[PDB]
Amino acid sequence: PCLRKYKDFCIHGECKYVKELRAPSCICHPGYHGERCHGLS
């Protein structure tokens, strides 16, 4: 689902659909934060 629907959602992170909660998530790369891993700090 990250391929099709939630593509490009995650900025500085890897998209992972969390089935249980029925929503995508972004595993922020080192130092980033945000639902979409938009910011550093």
């Binding site: 939630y6 959602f9 992170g13 890897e14 992972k16 659909y17 969390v18 089935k19 249980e20 909660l21 029925r22 929503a23 995508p24 998530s25 972004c26 595993i27 922020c28 790369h29 080192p30 130092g31 934060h33 945000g34 639902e35 979409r36 910011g39 700090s41």
Partner: protein, 518 residues
């Protein structure tokens, strides 16, 4: 037990021990000739220096007018021969004397100057200097010299701010900015003073501004109606070509909205009066306890957005024109003289204080024990060790994360745990959240090999009076240390309620950043 109060790792002996001292104004030349002596703990009577010249600089302001006085300077003081720096694990003199077996009936720093103490704890040196961590949140240390031993010091000048004859404390902060400029805000306040003055006059002589200045009811009005004028004046003023760059960097972030400059202008108008407006110390004093300043400073989200002389100048200029419109609507003084005069000076000083804070090293939200405050929640590592994930051994480790919310009951959907298979995997059974004593187990599941997701078995809410502790347990099967390239993410994502971010339903992510060590 000397090992109980003396941090031997940080204790050492060296030839020509040198340190720095912040010198108040009027004492720059005199101190360059020798260290001479002039609380509830008589024990710490002594000459104080620090290993950091920039921190030392901070202490060069008039103790009389601490907020906005002028700066003195920094001198480097050195001890001839050998000096023993005895770093201390505590700052309680009584406890120190007991453990160090000293006269409990005499001051501490005076015993530190006696040959008896210099013999026993001196490890050879001519004198001893006490060393304690400068402060909480710093790497610098504070050197406490014995008054007698300190006459032996050799004073050499490092910097003299007063000698630069620069406005306010510009010289001083320009110096401190060097600490990072080897974010890092290194501005030229002279330029900012110039640009601001030029823009204030340009705005004043602008048709639309004058045009709007006339729509001003000019006599006291309700603050509700006042804001509305200032907000309109704002939109108009921001159209001016000189403020082009502000109009741009301001249109996105809510903090920088015209309503914010408006409410700020009004706050200022409400607290300044003829007495206050006349004194620089008194003004800066009033201004400094008012909220909404980040709006004119362009500071928000952990960043100083107004990073240039140009934008800084434009913001201050606009803020000054607005404050001038605000004064007649709720103030009670000589209507404007203040706004272009004292207000600019005080505000410039406050900018300098905050910029100095961001230039200093610090732990961001979610790091070490610093809380991460988002969507009403407040999470953080229980202890510094919890934020540290060790590697290079086979085995377990547990990690506590304090979680809570400001008011109403907020949920915790679950938690996202980054993993490195073989070196770092979730111990599904040693992992739980306890809400007010209620230990609740979690259903974990490796979504990928890169992240496991744990969800509480019974619903979890936190709020005012309802706190929780998330305990992440890690397991290591390989005794090989995790390598940098392997680290695909350095934080734990605690998920809160479900919101809609840019059209997609996602859960509030509260991040706890960690460090892999050992």
């Amino acid at each position: 037990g000397a090992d109980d109060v003396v941090d031997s790792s940080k204790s050492f002996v060296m030839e020509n021990f040198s340190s720095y001292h912040g010198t108040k104004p009027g004492y720059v030349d005199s101190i360059q000739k020798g260290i001479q002596k002039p609380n509830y703990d008589d024990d710490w009577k002594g000459f104080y220096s620090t290993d950091n010249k920039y921190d030392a600089a901070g202490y060069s302001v008039d103790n009389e007018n601490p907020l906005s006085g002028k700066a003195g300077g920094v001198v480097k003081v050195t001890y001839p021969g050998l000096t023993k720096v005895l770093a201390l694990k505590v700052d309680n003199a009584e406890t120190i004397k007991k453990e160090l077996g000293l006269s409990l009936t005499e001051p501490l720093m005076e015993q530190v100057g006696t040959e008896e103490f210099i013999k026993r704890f001196g490890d050879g040196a001519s004198r001893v200097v006490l060393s304690l961590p400068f402060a909480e949140g710093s790497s610098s240390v504070e050197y406490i010299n014995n008054w007698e031993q300190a006459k032996a010091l050799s004073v050499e000048l490092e910097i003299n701010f007063e000698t630069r004859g620069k406005r306010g404390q510009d010289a001083m902060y320009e110096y401190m900015a060097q600490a990072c400029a080897g974010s890092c805000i290194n501005l030229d306040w002279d330029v900012i003073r110039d640009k601001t003055k030029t823009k204030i006059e340009s705005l004043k002589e602008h048709g639309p501004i004058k045009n709007k200045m006339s729509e001003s009811p000019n006599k006291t009005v309700s603050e509700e109606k006042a804001k509305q004028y200032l907000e309109e004046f704002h939109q108009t003023a921001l159209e001016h070509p000189e403020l082009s760059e502000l109009k741009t960097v301001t249109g996105t972030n809510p903090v920088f909205a015209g309503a914010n400059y408006a409410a700020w202008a009004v706050n200022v108008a409400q607290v300044i009066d003829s007495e206050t407006a006349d004194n620089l110390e008194k003004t800066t004093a009033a201004l400094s306890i008012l909220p909404g300043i980040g709006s004119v400073m362009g500071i928000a989200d952990g960043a100083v957005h107004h990073n240039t002389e140009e934008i800084v100048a434009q913001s201050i200029a606009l803020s000054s024109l607005m404050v001038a419109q605000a004064i007649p609507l709720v103030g009670e003084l000589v209507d404007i003289g203040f706004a272009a005069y004292n207000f600019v000076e005080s505000i410039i000083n406050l900018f300098q204080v905050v910029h100095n804070s961001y230039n200093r090293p610090a732990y961001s939200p979610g790091h070490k024990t610093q809380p991460f405050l988002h969507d009403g929640y407040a999470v953080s590592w229980n202890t510094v060790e919890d934020s540290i994930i060790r590697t290079g051994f086979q085995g377990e480790s547990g990690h506590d994360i304090k979680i809570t919310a400001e008011n109403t009951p907020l949920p915790i959907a679950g938690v996202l745990l980054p993993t490195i298979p073989g070196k770092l995997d979730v111990n599904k059974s040693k992992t739980h959240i306890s809400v007010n004593g209620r230990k609740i187990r979690m259903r974990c599941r490796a979504i990928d090999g890169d992240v496991t997701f744990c969800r509480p078995k019974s619903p979890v809410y936190v709020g005012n009076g309802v706190h929780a502790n998330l305990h992440v347990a890690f397991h290591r099967s390989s005794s090989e240390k995790i390598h940098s390239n392997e680290i695909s993410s350095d934080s734990i994502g605690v998920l809160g309620y479900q919101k809609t971010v840019d059209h997609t339903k996602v859960n509030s992510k509260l991040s706890l950043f960690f460090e892999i060590k050992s």
